[PDB]
Design a protein around this ligand. Sequence first.
Ligand SMILES: *[C@@]([C])([C][O])[C@](*)(=O)[C]([C][C]1[C][C][C][C][C]1)[N]C(=O)[C]([C]C1=[C][N]C2=C1[C]=[C][C]=[C]2)[N]C(=O)[C]([C])[N]C(=O)C1=C([C])C2=C([C]1)[C]=[C][C]=[C]2
Ligand SMILES: [Mg+2]
Lengths: 233, 235, 231, 211, 240, 250, 222, 244
Amino acid sequence: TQQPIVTGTSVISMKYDNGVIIAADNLGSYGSLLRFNGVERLIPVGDNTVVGISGDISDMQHIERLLKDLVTENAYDNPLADAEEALEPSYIFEYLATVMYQRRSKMNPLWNAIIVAGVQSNGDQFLRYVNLLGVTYSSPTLATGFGAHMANPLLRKVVDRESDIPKTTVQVAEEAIVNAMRVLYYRDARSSRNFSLAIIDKNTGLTFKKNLQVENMKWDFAKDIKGYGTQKI
Amino acid sequence: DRGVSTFSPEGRLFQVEYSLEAIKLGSTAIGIATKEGVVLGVEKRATSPLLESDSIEKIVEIDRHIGCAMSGLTADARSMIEHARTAAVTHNLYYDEDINVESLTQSVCDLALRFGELMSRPFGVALLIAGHDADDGYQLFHAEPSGTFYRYNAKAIGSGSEGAQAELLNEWHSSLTLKEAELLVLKILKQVMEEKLDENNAQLSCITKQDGFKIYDNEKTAELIKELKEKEAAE
Amino acid sequence: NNYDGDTVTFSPTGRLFQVEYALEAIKQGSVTVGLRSNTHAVLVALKRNADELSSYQKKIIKCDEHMGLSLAGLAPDARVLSNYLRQQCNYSSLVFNRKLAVERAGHLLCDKAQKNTQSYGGRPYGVGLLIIGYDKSGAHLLEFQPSGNVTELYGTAIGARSQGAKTYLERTLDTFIKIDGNPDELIKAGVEAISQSLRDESLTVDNLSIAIVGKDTPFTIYDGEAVAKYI
Amino acid sequence: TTTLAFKFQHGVIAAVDSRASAGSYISALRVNKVIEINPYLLGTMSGCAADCQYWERLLAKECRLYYLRNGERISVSAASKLLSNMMCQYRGMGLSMGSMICGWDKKGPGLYYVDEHGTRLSGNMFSTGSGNTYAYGVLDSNYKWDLSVEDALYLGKRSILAAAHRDAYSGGSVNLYHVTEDGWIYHGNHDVGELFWKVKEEEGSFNNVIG
Amino acid sequence: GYDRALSIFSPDGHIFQVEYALEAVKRGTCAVGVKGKNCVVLGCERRSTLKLQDTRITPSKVSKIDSHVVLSFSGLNADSRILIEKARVEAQSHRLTLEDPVTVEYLTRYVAGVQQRYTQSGGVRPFGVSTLIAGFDPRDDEPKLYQTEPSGIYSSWSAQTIGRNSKTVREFLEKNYDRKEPPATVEECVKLTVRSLLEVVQTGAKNIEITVVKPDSDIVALSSEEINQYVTQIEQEKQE
Amino acid sequence: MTDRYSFSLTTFSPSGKLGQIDYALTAVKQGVTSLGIKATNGVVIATEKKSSSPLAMSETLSKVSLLTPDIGAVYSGMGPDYRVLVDKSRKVAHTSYKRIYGEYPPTKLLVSEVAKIMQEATQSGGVRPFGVSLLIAGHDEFNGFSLYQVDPSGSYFPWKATAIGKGSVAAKTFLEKRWNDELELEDAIHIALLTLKESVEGEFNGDTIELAIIGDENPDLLGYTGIPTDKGPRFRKLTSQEINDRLEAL
Amino acid sequence: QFNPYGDNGGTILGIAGEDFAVLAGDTRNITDYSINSRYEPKVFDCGDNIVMSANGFAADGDALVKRFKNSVKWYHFDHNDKKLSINSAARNIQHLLYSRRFFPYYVYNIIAGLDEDGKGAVYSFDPVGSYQREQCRAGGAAASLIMPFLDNQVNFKNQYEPGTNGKVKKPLKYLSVEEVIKLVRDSFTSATERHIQVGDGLEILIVTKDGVRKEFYELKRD
Amino acid sequence: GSRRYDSRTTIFSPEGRLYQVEYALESISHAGTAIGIMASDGIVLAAERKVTSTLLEQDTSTEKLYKLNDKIAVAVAGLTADAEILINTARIHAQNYLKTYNEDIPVEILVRRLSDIKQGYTQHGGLRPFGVSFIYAGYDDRYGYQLYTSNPSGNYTGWKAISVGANTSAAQTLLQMDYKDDMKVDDAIELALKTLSKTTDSSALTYDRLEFATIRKGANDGEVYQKIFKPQEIKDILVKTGIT
Ligand SMILES: *[C@@]([C])([C][O])[C@](*)(=O)[C]([C][C]1[C][C][C][C][C]1)[N]C(=O)[C]([C]C1=[C][N]C2=C1[C]=[C][C]=[C]2)[N]C(=O)[C]([C])[N]C(=O)C1=C([C])C2=C([C]1)[C]=[C][C]=[C]2
Ligand SMILES: [Mg+2]
């Protein structure tokens, strides 16, 4: 049993017709203090998977090393390490899911919520969630922390059920993700303007975008708002 | 000296091969499998007339549907029987059902090669494991100290084994009744035994689906001996 | 001679005699054949009986839905090693949701057998194994020796008189490799291969044991009247 | 639950109700609170359902093994003690199990009370569960050693009914058992709803209730 | 720990260490067991090479395992103490877990199991001891007499002897003991036990120990004078 | 790996001999001579500093060792075995005594502990006996001065005076003629130097001889003042100069 | 303080027919007032004509199913490909659950299939391993809403034959698979209305001698 | 591996003897003779030190006679170092019994314990046995005065008079001849010394070559006193009995 110290907030994601998108801001909070402003919380594994992590950052860094070690270990005595016997999103997820549930069963959890986003060998989209309790679930849209409350409602308007996935283009999906990130910046007190976004497409491969900013923000209407009820000036 | 788990130049484990020699010195045990049941019979071989022969327990119940006969260093069998009984009942606990005869035999044979430098030497006893289950019916297995087990329609182990096995070769057919099998075990036991066969120095047993595993009374066996004598005198 | 008392001792020419004696146990064992195409992999095994009243000792063991082996030598050692493979195949599935690669299965068997050849007190395994399987890189066939050496092959055979079947496969190499999408013809080639190792005895209904795995075929074993088709 | 068991002239009676609770919610109307350990041994159940089932089915494993080794049926005294010894290993761990071990052996009929604390009591009559106080009232006023099997079966049946009525966490149905030297005999499943009205009319009891 | 396999098979299928343990038993002083109709008697030889002995405190040959079971032996004396101690512990352990005293058959089976374990365990040698275990089961008037040996085999006997010159006294018992009519009384049973030892013992003085076990935990050891009266009567009948 | 020698390497032979102990005693016989003499008001222990090379600094190699402030030791036989015994003896004096009773052990009991360690090397698995004989001199309040010999077997005997190693047979004879129950410490040192000269071949001076005494309390060697009951160690190693001074009156 | 348990909601329902059995469950997965997934399968085909569902804390439920599926696999290996009977599976699960008597699988488990006589069978468990064969059982969040309805409409409880006035009960006529599925769908439609954790979708697994069949039905998504 | 160098200390010979036990007994037969004699009013322990020197400090020396507690003592024959290991174990066992039951340990119970330890080294562990034979002289309120002996086999027996070590065959004959049941301590003292005087391999028996002890109820009223004789006291009893 512990308590999380340096923390990372929402990770959001969704499926689209040819792949999956995932995003997460670059902040490492120390309680209410916005301590670290250059933290990467999306961690690619090969060219077919991106693992997005929220929660305790020390535990994130530990997981990041487990994944790095996993790639090394898979290459051992494996001539097809960059081909048929490469690491799949489903392999990477199940490994993490096994670890997360084992750690909670020893009453010493990794204090995180993880989303593994990727594309399988056969071109199928992979998107699944796991957390400190070892709880797992999959959905066309997935989000952690505040994202679950604010992002999912917006992303579910684009892909409400399974049959909406082939009807969703990458431009529409990215637009929806970027808008969700803006909404979270308005409303999440432990979020930052700067974020990273990753697209894993079955055709164009892994596109990893860094140093993105929330833009087109509405603040002008604030000038008119005065007092808390009766005040006019 | 030399390792206990050493291979000979011929590719055999010395200790396993030597334990087989101890089994050849053991008293004769015979098993015959039929569609009406499996019969198990043994030579008691008391070392003195003062020894109360009914205390010689070379036929043993493992479960209600599985019996066992032994030959060789019979003291070694006690822990094997204990494990067998535990395995049989433990499976009944975990799965609410009778355990398969083969699965029971396999569990016993897993102990066999657990020796080295675990126990210090192989077992010096061979077992005939007879039983019944719903999947494969009436079965007879021969469990060795090598860890190997063969299924048999009929089998003899102990000192008079190769003489008895040749006899079982000729006599066994797929349409044998239980009564016929009983007399056949008695016939072959009487043939290979040193002393004259009677109800006190030989013991019969069987396993049927209905009644399960039963050791025969000395009064019941005595009648089967008398029935044998008369039918041999009939031609 | 003086250097065969245990596995921890090299001879003056750099030989390990206990390992070589364990290799000898395989040569005494009954013949078994392995061969594959690009779509399927096949095991064919000649089972051995104690006498006419006895059953025919089983030679083929299933390890997973996509993998299994045939044995030649000490059967209990095959049970120990096949049990280990079952666990490793199972660990791969439960943890990584991944079917264990046949090549990696061989590497694991090699390393398990090796530890028994370098340590005092223990002994080498006294059995040879032919592992077939179908994974993400297609059909495979492996030959395991208790020295630790594991070899990926198109076809092979181990046991008594196995040299005859091995020569046949070496001639037929170009033919049987091309038998794609036809399980019955691949088995025929295996049955014809193992037939080159027979003397006096012939293939009967309770004598022959066959196994197959392939693209859309789980590892299944055929015994009894199921192999009468191929006699 | 309510369970009872008592010795008498022609063996021992065992009766239990059939309810299972999850707080206020009745989770099961018809559970079996008696385990047939062997043809001559019974075990009642009260407390944690899982504990009762696991440990008494494990007792039956150990009782079977006794027969195989000794070639003789286990006594009720020995069986009850094996169970109590199991409880003493998990002493303080939080097990909840109250049971009667009923049977017939060489000393005649035998009845032992065993609970989670490792307690082991020999006696002629016992009753366990949330509704035992109600069962004892009927039993104590009507029990004799000189009972007929027919009357004894009814007494235990009626004693459970008493408890099923008043106790909120007892009811559903009644299961009867009669243990003899030729083994135990099951005397059926009796719905309390139907039994109540039947007993009320025939016996004249429960005048307070309107039917 | 010391794991060395001392008891192993030889090419001819023998475990020599177990067989050499039987030679230690052959060296041991003679012990005899005879069961009558309502009793069992245990006779034991005391070698008279050791005089100036304090017979009050010297370990007696017959040992009580419980109030209703006794154990005598032949072979290594030190080894016998280890078996007796284990047996006595098991006797109390059985009473504690099952609430009945051990049967003579069960106690024998346990002691024989211990002896067997020491023939296939690493680092240990077999017990150089054979035992005679006698008594009456709880609430049973049928006499019980069992024998064990280093290999771990055990069996029930109407009458049996072990130790040095046991071949001779077994010869005597085989012709003198009738199964159809066993020693009806205590006297007849003791007389036959003393007679059998007189075939081997030497002097009938302090060389013979007798212990009578009757049903319901009635165990007594005879004194020198009581035994001496049997010795006197036997030889006076023999002079004819 | 693992230490698989869990069995005794010292065993009884048909004749009743414990071979390894005998052979250890043979190694002691080959070793350089050392001796011990007990006086009325002290004990002296002495030996030859047999230097392996003249380039070697023999002052760094200490054959005579302090075990406790009132107990000293010297040996004959294998030096490395002696060195580790001194380390163990120093430690056991603390663990099994001083940390319990708050004082240093008496000579006889420390000897008893050293003896026990040497006995266990004679019976325990996978080890050979120690190839040394020790002479332990010491003082304690209730037993006074004492001198003990300890052998590879673990046996120990108290002596008025004795010698071990190379020329022990001759040296013990020399001591029998000179020893009496009225000797002062200086007289015992004088006899020690005379006895030791017979077994030495080459140079005989303060730099080639190692000699220590158990005598009067040395408050100058205590290192602190203020506690009346603490009067300093009775063990003192004689200097090179102090030896040479007594070699002129020889 | 760390709390190793959680509640993922959901509700399951098993009904045993004369020669068939059904195991139904909603596809909604939740924490607190949020929805995780609208379609997350909860009822699984475990092999040997057995279906299983571990309702409650999803992580513990997924672990138990995973372990039982594994137990079926090793049963085949160890006992010559023998078919695991439904009664044997039940007893095996009891021991899986009790292995954690002091750190329980927080799940209400139900399995369904056919007994060795070919008749329909349902077995119901508590979190610590107590089980029993049942005809009708609802488990999970809306268990208390559904069970009374099944007592009434499956076992005809409190129902009597008109004209007799409480003297003669309604006879216990057997139900067809079509009739059962109607009662299942109505049960989940009613449960969806009055329970916030139930909704999104309904997945039913039907077991007969011919095998395991699936049926899916939409539920209200609010 | 290591097996090559294993002597196998705990095995039977073809004749059914324990090699190492027999060879340990051979060792003990060369040790100094120790004698124990039990009388009605006490027990005597006499023992011969092995070829001593004039420079040996006798008054502070102890190789033969050891105190286990106030009621029980032992005479040693064999390896002294081995004996001290066992003696310290016995001293502890006596104190454990006293702490547990608040009564002094009965003599036999202590003897059995030590003998069981010796037995263990002959059956398991692969170690050499202890090359020691003890004579136990003790008193308790059950059996009164008691003499026991134990040897490396772990076998123990009770005695009226007994010898261990060298020349036991000769010594036992001499004791068997002159010993009587109604004997007293002063007479037993004389017998013990006379026996050693005749069996000794030395030219003459002197005070410096002896260890001597008595266990007497010759303590003021109902209680028992152990007396380990001093060198001067051994010299006086030698003159008294007329040996020097
Ligand atoms: C009375 C009804 C007690 O209220 C009786 O004592 C029964 C005993 C009976 C033993 C044999 C198995 C069935 C129970 N006790 C219970 O029913 C207990 C009461 C209880 C004790 N401690 C505790 C209890 C309830 C809740 C928390 C703690 N009830 C249970 O153990 C509950 C958990 N059992 C179930 O819910 C069961 C279900 C749903 C079920 C069971 C048990 C068995 C088979 C199928 C389903
Ligand atoms: Mg809603």
